[PDB]
A paper describes a structure:
Mammalian p97 (also called valosin-containing protein or VCP, cdc48 in yeast, and Ter94 in Drosophila) is a highly conserved AAA (ATPases associated with various cellular activities) protein with a homo-hexameric ring structure; each p97 subunit is composed of two AAA ATPase domains (D1 and D2) preceded by an N-terminal domain (N domain). VIMP, also known as selenoprotein S, is a 21 kDa ER membrane protein. VIMP, together with Derlins, is thought to contribute to the association of the p97-Ufd1-Npl4 complex with the ER membrane, forming an ER membrane-associated module in ERAD. Here we show that VIMP has an essential role in recruiting p97 to the ER membrane.
Taking advantage of the pathogenic p97 mutants that are able to achieve uniform subunit conformation in the presence of ATP analogs, we successfully obtained crystals of VIMPx in complex with two ND1p97 mutants (residues 1−460), each carrying a single pathogenic mutation either in the N-D1 linker region (L198W, ND1p97L198W) or in the D1 domain (A232E, ND1p97A232E), in the presence of the non-hydrolyzable ATP analog AMP-PNP. A second complex between the p97 mutant L198W (ND1p97L198W) and VIMPx was crystallized. This crystal has a larger unit cell sufficient for two ND1p97L198W subunits (chains A and B) and two VIMPx molecules (chains C and D) in a crystallographic asymmetric unit, which, after symmetry expansion, represent two separate hexameric rings packed back-to-back in the crystal lattice. AMP-PNP moieties were found bound to the D1 domains of both subunits. A difference Fourier map showed densities corresponding to VIMPx molecules binding to each p97 subunit. A 38-residue fragment (residues 73−110) representing helix H2 was assigned to the VIMPx bound to chain A, and the density associated with chain B was fit with a 61-residue model (residues 43−65, 71−109) that included both helices H1 and H2. The H1 helix in the longer VIMP model of the ND1p97L198W-VIMPx crystal is stabilized by interactions with an N domain of a neighboring molecule in the crystal. Although the elbow angle (142.7°) between helices H1 and H2 in the complex (D chain in the ND1p97L198W-VIMPx) is not very different from those (132.9° and 142.2°) found in the VIMP-alone structures, the directions of the H1 helix (defined by the swing angle) in these structures are different, further supporting the notion that there is an intrinsic flexibility built into the H1-H2 joint. Inclusion of VIMP models led to successful crystallographic refinement of the structure, giving rise to an Rwork and Rfree of 23.3 and 29.3, respectively. It is worth mentioning that the two crystal forms obtained here resulted from differing amounts of ethanol present in the crystallization conditions rather than a difference in the mutation site, as the L198W mutant can be crystallized in both forms. Visual inspection suggested that the two subunits of the ND1p97L198W-VIMPx complex in the asymmetric unit have different N domain conformations.
Numbering used by the authors:
A (entry chain A): 21 to 460
B (entry chain C): 73 to 110
C (entry chain B): 14 to 460
D (entry chain D): 43 to 65, 71 to 109
Write the structure that this text describes.
């Protein structure tokens, strides 16, 4: 808990630049009505906004309409970080584009009928990669901010030039950006995420500090767990969240290649990392590359492991490269790899407690049409020894029951399906019981 | 005129949002107190 | 389903406190008395939990509901029931004027006996009242500033009589130890078993039902099952279920304890095995229960001993040597099912098997609830939570959790107490409660 | 003598039988009336309470 962190809650008014706080909080924070504020949300995303004063707002909460939440990637009742933005320039020239489906017959009159009214004499702040929404005529239209002179944020004043030029932005390409995995799509691991950050991000971010107290960082890290726990996910997140250049080595993929091409790609990744450094090489499925040499009755397979050992070893401390790796079969990795200098530190991405199971379920239902009678906590308790995967697929099977309970109203032979019936569709508790009774 | 113009036109622009918020706030406050008996 | 459940009937009634505090007084509503063919101040047989009966004076009360019945503590205690149980009432038209009745007082309500009890307490109470009493009623009398509790030990004739002016009143013997009654109070019946309706139901219907209605089966041309086997892991409640079936059931019950039979000398075992089966055949309808069967009748392969095998044979031959008309059921129980000699689970022998398994969180709750009913629980205690926090836990485990909770709670007060005091400050005892954190501390020790 | 002694013994077995099983109406009623009158006195001391409670109900609900 801190002053500048606040719980997210819907705004009363629907203005795209408006973030409502309580007076006490504004005073505490040294903020005046209609200052410009930097909100920081999920996935590194920031939005820049106009703070205003609202009586019905709690001290610990903050109010914001969809369009802001979306661009902080947050949701109703997350926490966000707010701070003053006293640098904010009057923008010179800003490029905006509309989003391919919101506008059909598209780039006719969007300057005059939508944007100009919206922006004009309002002095709104906007940020690079804010997507916003404007209503004009009977239609509504979504506009991405592509670039702003100067970047990333500006105040759009009467003389700021407004470029409506380019190709309409595809829905798909912006949906792709929604599905990025970050540390918030991971449930029940604060303990470990914490460690990973401090073995990996902290010595790549502050290598001064460790040479300064006369200490060497850890440089080989190993995630292990049973399977379904979240290791492959934690890496996919680390990748999207981290400062460094990130090269991913997928075990079975390296081993799919031809005698020698493997060893090549192995080197290439270590070279490409040493080169772009500060870097994280991640090896998923380590067990598939570097098994216990006893078990592998093959010439080449042993050559690979050597090749790997020699790259691990062949890293000067000043390279600024971390190797993460991950496996479910720890004890089957060649013991050579967990020596000093190599995979020194190990992190148990274990089975989660009922708390974790909850977080997980909660993540996996956030985009899900849940009824009133659904008791996630309960499900969490009814699911002992379940892992991330298991619990996800449970939420699937729940929904695929819920859908199955409407197959009277639907046709498999229709081209697509009655919208009313889709909009209507909700996941009951009994859907969850039916699911639970299949996965036992 | 201008370097002052921008600042006053802006402050006066915010103070006008503030009004159109406060406008809502009371409408809602009164619907809360209208709710809690009704 | 598991369908052995209480049915509504006329003579079954819901228990509720009496208005007056008279120990022979059971208040009904007129309509009910009429429906039942009962007149004011008749003598009634109330039957309660654990085969307990009391015999009483029925009277008429207006504020009494039709489906309820009123009775002061002292009756409920002797029916072993509680406020809002159901009890069974029926006429007692045999009731003799008693000739001579032995009563005794209870040790801790007489500390410093003034020794005059015939005159101060009993005689006033009994005399010219014509109260009915039953063998093993414990009743309460106020005389002087003190109150005194008296057990009825025997009554001539027994088990009930009417105590009239000339019924002789024996105050002879040694004052009854509180203990030796609070042992009979804390004896187990079905209600002290948690998370097993499914199985209890079964047991009742493979055992009690054919012993109670052997007409019915010979009548639809069917043979009852006659060997039943309880199995589970250990801690689950098997040894408990038998101890309850015993206190609850119709039949003469003989218990054979495995390790105890095997503690005896070459031949004395085989004797006692016979003696039990004989004694049962003889008092029948009977239930023989064998606890720890695995300790008598292991897989003959494993037991490199002469006698051990002779015992199993002895057992087999008694099991087999039961005529259907004997009217005996053999229950037995074990935690190591697969280790019992396979000869025993044949036809004619232990035919049916009952899994007294690991309980679900619902069961775990019932269990925890049973284990804390005599326990000084705080407001912040969330039994339901604890039930959920305790996967794979069995009866035993949950009990000992509730012990360890309380032993923490006790440990949190050791500043206020002394190990070297003789007994302990009452205020501090009366004050003592079990918190939730006591339970967390417990949960974190048993994992 | 001994041809009479078993005839003699039987006879005085039937003299103790008829003596002991020889050796009501003026107490048969007393017991029943003293009892009915004993119950009908409990009935009173109950009814006595009943109304005292009925009136504390009606006193409670206002
Ligand atoms: N910690 C978690 N939080 C939320 N969802 C999870 C978590 N762990 C697993 N899941 C769900 O299940 C999927 C599979 O997990 P994955 O990332 O492959 O972990 P893993 O343990 O590396 N599996 P494996 O490749 O067999 O070792 C994830 O993408 C999620 O959909
Ligand atoms: N179903 C239950 N309901 C309530 N209490 C239980 C239950 N099961 C076990 N307990 C508690 O655990 C104690 C020991 O259980 P016990 O009756 O010995 O079971 P058991 O399975 O026969 N053990 P074992 O002799 O090893 O097979 C009982 O006295 C209870 O206090
Ligand atoms: Mg046992």
């Amino acid at each position: 808990n801190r002053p500048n962190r606040l719980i997210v809650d819907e705004a009363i008014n629907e203005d795209n630049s408006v973030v409502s706080l309580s007076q006490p909080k504004m005073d505490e924070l040294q903020l005046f009505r209609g200052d410009t504020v930097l909100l920081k949300g999920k996935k590194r995303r920031e939005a820049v906004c106009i703070v205003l004063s609202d009586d019905t707002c709690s001290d610990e909460k903050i109010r914001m309409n969809r369009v802001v939440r979306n661009n902080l990637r947050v949701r109703l009742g997350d926490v966000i970080s707010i701070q003053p933005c006293p640098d904010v320039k009057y923008g010179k020239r800003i490029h905006v584009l509309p989003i391919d489906d919101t506008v059909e017959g598209i780039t006719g009159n969007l300057f005059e009928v939508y944007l100009k009214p919206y922006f004009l004499e309002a002095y709104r702040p906007i940020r690079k990669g804010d997507i916003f929404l404007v209503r004009g005529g009977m239609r509504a239209v979504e506009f991405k901010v592509v670039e702003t002179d100067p970047s990333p944020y500006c105040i759009v004043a009467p003389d700021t030039v407004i470029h409506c030029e380019g190709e309409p932005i595809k829905r798909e390409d912006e949906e792709e950006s929604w599905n990025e995995v970050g540390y918030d799509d991971i449930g029940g691991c604060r303990k470990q995420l914490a460690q990973i950050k401090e073995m990996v991000e902290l010595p790549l971010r502050h290598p001064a500090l460790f040479k300064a107290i006369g200490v060497k960082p850890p440089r080989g890290i190993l995630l292990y767990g049973p399977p379904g726990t979240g290791k492959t996910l934690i890496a996919r997140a680390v990748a999207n969240e981290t400062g460094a250049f990130f090269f991913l080595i997928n075990g079975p993929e390296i081993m799919s290649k031809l005698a020698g091409e493997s060893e090549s790609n192995l080197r290439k990744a270590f070279e490409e990392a040493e080169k772009n450094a500060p870097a994280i090489i991640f090896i998923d499925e380590l067990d598939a590359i570097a098994p216990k040499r006893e078990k592998t009755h093959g010439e080449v397979e042993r050559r690979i492991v050597s090749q790997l050992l020699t790259l691990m070893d062949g890293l000067k401390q000043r390279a600024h490269v971390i190797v993460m790796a991950a496996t479910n079969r720890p004890n089957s990795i060649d013991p050579a790899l967990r020596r000093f200098g190599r995979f020194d530190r190990e992190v148990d991405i274990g089975i989660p407690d009922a708390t974790g199971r909850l977080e997980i379920l909660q993540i996996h239902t956030k985009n899900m049409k849940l009824a009133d009678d659904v008791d996630l906590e309960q499900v969490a308790n009814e699911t002992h020894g379940h892992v991330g995967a298991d619990l996800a697929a449970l939420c699937s099977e729940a929904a695929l029951q819920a859908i199955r309970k409407k197959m009277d109203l639907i046709d498999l032979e229709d081209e697509t399906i009655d919208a009313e019936v889709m909009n209507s569709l909700a996941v009951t508790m009994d859907d969850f019981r039916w699911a639970l009774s299949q996965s036992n | 005129d201008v370097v002052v113009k921008r600042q006053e036109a802006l402050a006066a622009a915010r103070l006008k949002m503030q009004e159109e918020l406060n406008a809502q706030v009371e409408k809602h406050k009164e619907k809360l107190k209208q709710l809690e008996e009704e």
